[PDB]
Write a protein that binds this ligand. Structure first.
Ligand SMILES: COc1cc(Cc2cnc(N)nc2N)cc(/C=C/C(=O)N2N=Cc3ccccc3[C@@H]2CCC(F)(F)F)c1OC
Ligand SMILES: [Ca+2]
Ligand SMILES: [Cl-]
Length: 166
């Protein structure tokens, strides 16, 4: 099971402003949709409520400590262990955010899909710092910038840098 971070962030790692994306880039969201197709989306409750609804074609799994928390068309997990058990047969899952959710899955992450937006927005939640020396870029692509997607941004994908033995 591949554990993958799926994230869009600005030049200071902003991922949200008052439980919202500070930007509107439909093309980016269509990239997310294409990329996570057939695979679970793992998200914290706040991330989920900020998104607004179950994202179709997709196993939506909500991570909250709240044991009474239920929403229709979703699965709820209360810990990382619970998620791994729910996804026992999955090829790959996408940790979909909540800064706190990324931190929870950090010791398990194998793959990073990071959209970097070349701009500084106002924000209050951040993608946590990571040591990128442990990571190796395998794919990059400049996002579509137009009327509907005003900012410049790039899709990046990273895998573990393998150590050469001494
Ligand atoms: C805080 O608010 C949000 C945060 C995130 C998290 C996120 C976004 N982008 C990247 N690259 N990584 C993330 N973790 C998504 C979203 C929304 C994602 C959103 O609306 N979608 N994202 C994937 C998806 C998968 C299946 C069906 C539908 C979707 C839609 C895309 C459909 C479209 F655009 F083609 F019509 C969000 O709400 C605006
Ligand atoms: Ca791993
Ligand atoms: Cl969250």
């Amino acid at each position: 099971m591949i554990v993958s971070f799926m994230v869009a962030m600005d030049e200071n790692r902003v991922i949200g402003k008052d439980n919202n994306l500070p930007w509107r880039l439909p093309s980016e969201l269509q990239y997310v949709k294409k990329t996570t197709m057939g695979h679970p989306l793992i998200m914290g409750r706040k991330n989920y409520e900020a998104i607004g609804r179950p994202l179709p074609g997709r196993r939506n799994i909500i991570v909250t400590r709240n044991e009474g928390y239920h929403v229709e068309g979703c699965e709820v997990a209360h810990s990382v262990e619970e998620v791994f058990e729910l996804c026992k047969n999955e090829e790959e899952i996408f940790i979909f955010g909540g800064a706190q959710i990324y931190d929870l899955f950090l010791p398990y992450v194998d793959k990073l899909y990071i959209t970097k937006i070349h701009h500084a927005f106002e924000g209050d939640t951040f993608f946590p710092e990571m040591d990128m020396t442990n990571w190796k870029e395998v794919f990059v692509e400049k996002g579509l910038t137009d009327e509907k997607n005003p900012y410049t941004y790039y899709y990046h994908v990273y895998e573990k840098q393998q150590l050469v033995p001494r």
